[PDB]
Design a binder for this molecule. Structure first.
Ligand SMILES: [Mg+2]
Ligand SMILES: [Mg+2]
Ligand SMILES: [Mg+2]
Ligand SMILES: [Mg+2]
Ligand SMILES: [Mg+2]
Ligand SMILES: [Mg+2]
Ligand SMILES: [Mg+2]
Ligand SMILES: [Mg+2]
Ligand SMILES: [Mg+2]
Lengths: 109, 199, 176, 138, 190
RNA sequence: CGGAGCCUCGGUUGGCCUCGGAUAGCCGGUCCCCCGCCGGGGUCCGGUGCGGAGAGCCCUUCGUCCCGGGAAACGGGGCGGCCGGAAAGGGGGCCGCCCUCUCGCCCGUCACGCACCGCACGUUCGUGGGGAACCUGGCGCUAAACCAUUCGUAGACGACC
RNA sequence: UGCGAGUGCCUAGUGGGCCACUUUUGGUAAGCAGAACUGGCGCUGCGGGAUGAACCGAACGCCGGGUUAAGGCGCCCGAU
């Protein structure tokens, strides 16, 4: 009846100063701001949910406008709770600073 | 979802540093009352700096050259613009989702204004160091609305004081209320206390 | 030498190799403050080469061991005689410090000299360090702590941890 | 005006670091920003601590500036600091925060269901008081 | 080096009283009352002794340049007390060689008209800072007398008129005309 | 002002409705006291690593069905009037209304529901913005601008009077 | 200590060089002219020095994961 995922922001790609690696995304999960605090989310899978023009099939429902790219948190990134993620398709650059769902169910509690 | 910041007592660049990254990350930031932003260093230094910036001008056609905005809100906005990548469309979107005001307009005078201690003068400056006020600097470099903003701000202050006194009377009534009805609510105060919600 | 981290006190002993001229040369010991025993032995060879007619190849280290302080829980005043190379000429200097350990006092001296004269641990040449009785100290910055009923408040407590509640709604308090 | 001073014998709460959340007693002052400290009755060895990791409390127990852990301890138990600290409101809200962080799913459900009715009763009787103010104004 | 403590006290005479509102000092005595704010100097002000005998200013952990400011506060408070219990009187002499300097006082002692200075014809106005009264002396040939409660305002106004009567583009070593502060004292000479 | 749908653009997945400020000091009451149009000051009482705490507060939604306790009764919900706003104007409070419920909230009793057979974009803001039409109704409205012509306070041509 | 060596034919291009640490001649000096040793650029991309032939690191088949060099970690811009 309510939300079941954590909110994250797609901050950018894994990059040096002048080189971009599009196969690894950077997520900023809201609330966590520490390396020792970001351990809980390792291995959790994440979704990028967007809407397009024409209908697509929907598992367990009728076709609608929504589509998803599925990925997974790989490991932490820096001292400020930034995490790295790998999506099965590299994220489009129009998703910078947009909401990414981090699910709970790949759980190890 | 809208982050409303108060500008009084902050340091210009050190606050713009926070705001720029926050806006790049998609938040809608509204910085309010920018005439109270402070800058480290004494006033004569700061106005010489701004006058050198004023002298910066395109020799062939000044109307094409750098634009020297005089309002304090516009000075802060241009600082954030310099910290953002404004030549790209992502930076332009960030600029669009940032908004800055002088004084406190009616859209936001009825909202709780936050504060950023990381960019706060009392925290980041030794007490013996001198500083300056952005409102005074803007007025002395050309701003034409220091007095009107002052009168509107004081009006807002009496209205806010009326509201605050009403709030205080209401909450004193509430505390009188709870110490009136503690006997009937005693079965819940203990279950709050045992989990640390009270006291 | 690089004054990495907290220094340590090392007793280093050494002597020339036995030659047909003399069956056994005299032993020489020295107090050396260094991050570890490798640099301690390096500094021993440096100093003993400076003083006597000895070299790494013609001598040998006999015992290199850390020296622990005999009272690490009582505060002491240390007087330090040293020698450093400025941009123009070299100078002898006497300094006062106040802490628990001799190695701590020496590393504090290194930090102080770097901060105040821009001298560097390779230019600084420590020669003497002695624990000084409280009545023989000469510098006011350490003598003013020789008050049995010492008393002072903490006037202006600057806020730290200013990024954990990054966007707070309270103006921080500085008086406690 | 200041009320809390750093002299020999004052006890102080340790906010961050290894020995965080424990009381200590100032034994001596080394320099401008470091003190020789020892908490004998609270599992803290005698050592040096910066003043910026300590925050003073309004308790003073009296002993000489170079006394041993034996005498610091005897002062501690005869001044029974361990009970006065728990009686103070400072430690009460410390343990309140600790309990609130300790809550689980079920007991936070209980808290929600309890404060729901508590707030209902308070709000109703406040409305009653407001209309009482209106009627006596009339 | 940082000095642990630097303190200094000032005694308070009995007829006058002092009240402290933070770092603002309010002093009330027979001649009136006056207030000074010290929120720019960052010290500790205590008002100790029952029947309010001593004011103690002290600073903790200060270096040279602002442990030098401790005695400045004591001197200001002493000048303040002296003003409120005795008042300040600045006696100024008008000196000239050939042209008599004409001084006329108006607005009840708050404005000074200077005429015929060095034989000029431009009439020089000076307006006296509030709470300071200028009077023409008696039993003296060319003297102004300045009456006030605050040494700051009295001396500032005296300097105003002194540097208003100034000689330009000539040898001031020989053109020794103008009005200069001859003596600085009190109203009630106790 | 008063219905079903269609196409297109997307983002989002509970709200915080506000003192002013100081920082070598603050906050909250009280008024015994003093002034002013309830406000300011004085005394006193309490908090201050802030608990009248943004480390915070509010709302918290599986639904229905019987009966009991607690809480409510002055309450819930739905029509006429009074005020509340200008810096970029308040879907708020109050007074009556014809009506209806002992239902809403907390503990219990009672059973019931597509129990879709381990599996993903689920759960909103949202009658969202925009564009076309099908529409049943009511209240109303039947304008200008430009060209052509004329003018010369204007003018290369446009423009302008 | 390390390593498989010896040997014969035919042979293209080249025969304008330039730079840097230490040595060094002329010259007041030069992004000047002339030498010695070693390494580079020319013939060479890549990380850092904002920008750059020769500077610091490191030399290159097409890729996934991990870790580093020099240089860095307020925002632009990855990292206190
Ligand atoms: Mg002349
Ligand atoms: Mg949706
Ligand atoms: Mg050459
Ligand atoms: Mg070539
Ligand atoms: Mg080659
Ligand atoms: Mg190369
Ligand atoms: Mg450069
Ligand atoms: Mg790789
Ligand atoms: Mg950089």
């Amino acid at each position: 009846s309510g939300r079941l995922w954590c909110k994250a922001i797609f901050a950018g790609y894994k990059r040096g100063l002048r080189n971009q690696r599009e196969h690894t995304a950077l997520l900023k999960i809201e609330g966590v701001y520490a390396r020792d605090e970001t351990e809980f989310y390792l291995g959790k899978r994440c979704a990028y949910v967007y809407k397009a023009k024409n209908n697509t099939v929907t598992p367990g429902g009728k076709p609608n406008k929504t589509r998803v790219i599925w990925g997974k948190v790989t490991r932490a990134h820096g001292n400020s709770g930034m995490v790295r993620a790998k999506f099965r398709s590299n994220l489009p650059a129009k998703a910078i600073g947009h909401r990414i769902r981090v699910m709970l169910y790949p759980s190890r509690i | 979802q809208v982050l409303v910041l108060d500008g009084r007592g902050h340091l210009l660049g050190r606050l713009a540093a926070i705001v720029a990254k926050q806006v790049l990350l998609g938040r809608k930031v509204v910085v309010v009352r920018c005439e109270g932003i402070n800058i480290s260093g004494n006033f004569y230094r700061n106005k010489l700096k701004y006058l050198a910036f004023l002298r910066k001008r395109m020799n062939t056609n000044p109307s094409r050259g750098p634009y020297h905005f005089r309002a304090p809100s516009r000075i802060f906005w241009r600082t954030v613009r310099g910290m953002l990548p404004h030549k790209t469309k992502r930076g332009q979107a960030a600029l669009d989702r940032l908004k800055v005001f002088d004084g406190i307009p009616p859209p936001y005078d009825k909202k709780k204004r936050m504060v950023v201690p990381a960019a706060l003068k009392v925290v980041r400056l030794k007490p013996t160091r001198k500083f300056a006020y952005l409102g005074r600097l803007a007025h002395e470099v050309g701003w034409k609305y220091q007095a009107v903003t002052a009168t509107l701000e004081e009006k807002r202050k009496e209205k806010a004081k009326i509201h605050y006194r009403k709030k205080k009377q209401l909450m004193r009534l509430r505390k009188q209320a709870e110490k009136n009805v503690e006997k009937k609510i005693s079965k819940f105060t203990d279950v709050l206390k045992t989990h640390g919600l009270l006291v | 030498m690089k004054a990495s981290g907290t220094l340590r006190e090392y007793k280093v002993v050494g002597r020339c190799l036995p030659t047909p001229k003399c069956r056994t040369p005299p032993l020489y010991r020295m107090r050396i403050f260094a991050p570890n025993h490798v640099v301690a032995k390096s500094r021993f060879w440096y100093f003993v080469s400076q003083l006597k007619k000895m070299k790494k190849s013609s001598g040998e280290i006999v015992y290199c061991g850390q020296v622990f302080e005999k009272s690490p829980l009582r505060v002491k005043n240390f007087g330090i005689w040293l020698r450093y190379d400025s941009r123009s000429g070299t100078h002898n200097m006497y300094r006062e410090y106040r802490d628990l350990t001799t190695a701590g006092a020496v590393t504090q001296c290194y930090r102080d000299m770097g901060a105040r004269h821009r001298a560097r641990a390779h230019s600084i040449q420590i020669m003497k360090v002695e624990e000084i009785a409280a009545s023989k100290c000469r510098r006011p910055a350490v003598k003013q702590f020789h008050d049995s009923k010492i008393k002072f408040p903490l006037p202006h407590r600057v806020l730290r941890r200013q990024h954990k509640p990054r966007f707070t709604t309270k103006r921080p308090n500085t008086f406690f | 005006v200041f009320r809390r001073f750093v002299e020999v014998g004052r006890v102080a709460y340790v906010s961050f670091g290894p020995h965080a959340g424990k009381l200590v007693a100032i034994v001596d002052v080394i320099d401008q920003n470091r003190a020789l400290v020892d908490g004998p009755c609270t599992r803290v060895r005698r050592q040096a601590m910066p003043f910026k990791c300590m925050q003073l409390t309004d308790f003073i127990l009296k002993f000489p500036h170079s006394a041993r852990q034996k005498y610091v301890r005897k002062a501690w138990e005869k001044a029974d600091i361990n009970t006065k600290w728990a009686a103070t409101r400072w430690a009460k809200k410390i343990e309140a925060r600790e309990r609130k962080a300790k809550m689980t799913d079920f007991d936070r459900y209980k808290v929600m269901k309890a404060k729901k009715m508590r707030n209902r009763i308070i709000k109703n009787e406040v409305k009653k008081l407001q209309r009482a103010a209106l009627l006596k104004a009339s | 080096m940082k000095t642990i403590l630097s303190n200094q006290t000032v005694d308070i005479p009995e007829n006058v009283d002092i009240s402290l509102k933070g770092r603002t000092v309010i002093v009330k005595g027979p001649r009136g009352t006056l207030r000074r704010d010290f929120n720019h100097i960052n010290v500790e002000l205590s008002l100790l002794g029952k029947k309010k005998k001593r004011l103690r200013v002290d600073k903790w952990w200060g270096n040279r340049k602002e442990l030098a400011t401790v005695r400045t506060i004591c001197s200001h408070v002493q000048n303040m007390i002296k003003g409120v219990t005795l008042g300040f009187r600045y006696k100024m002499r008008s000196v000239y060689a050939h042209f008599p300097i004409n001084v006329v006082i108006q607005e009840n002692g708050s404005l000074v008209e200077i005429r015929n200075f060095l034989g000029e014809k431009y009439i020089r106005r000076v307006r006296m800072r509030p709470g300071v009264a200028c009077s023409v002396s008696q039993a003296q040939k060319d003297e102004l007398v300045l009456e006030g409660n605050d040494i700051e305002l009295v001396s500032n106004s005296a300097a105003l008129i002194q540097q208003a009567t100034t000689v330009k583009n000539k040898d001031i070593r020989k053109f020794l005309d103008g009005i200069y502060v001859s003596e600085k004292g009190t109203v009630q000479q106790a």
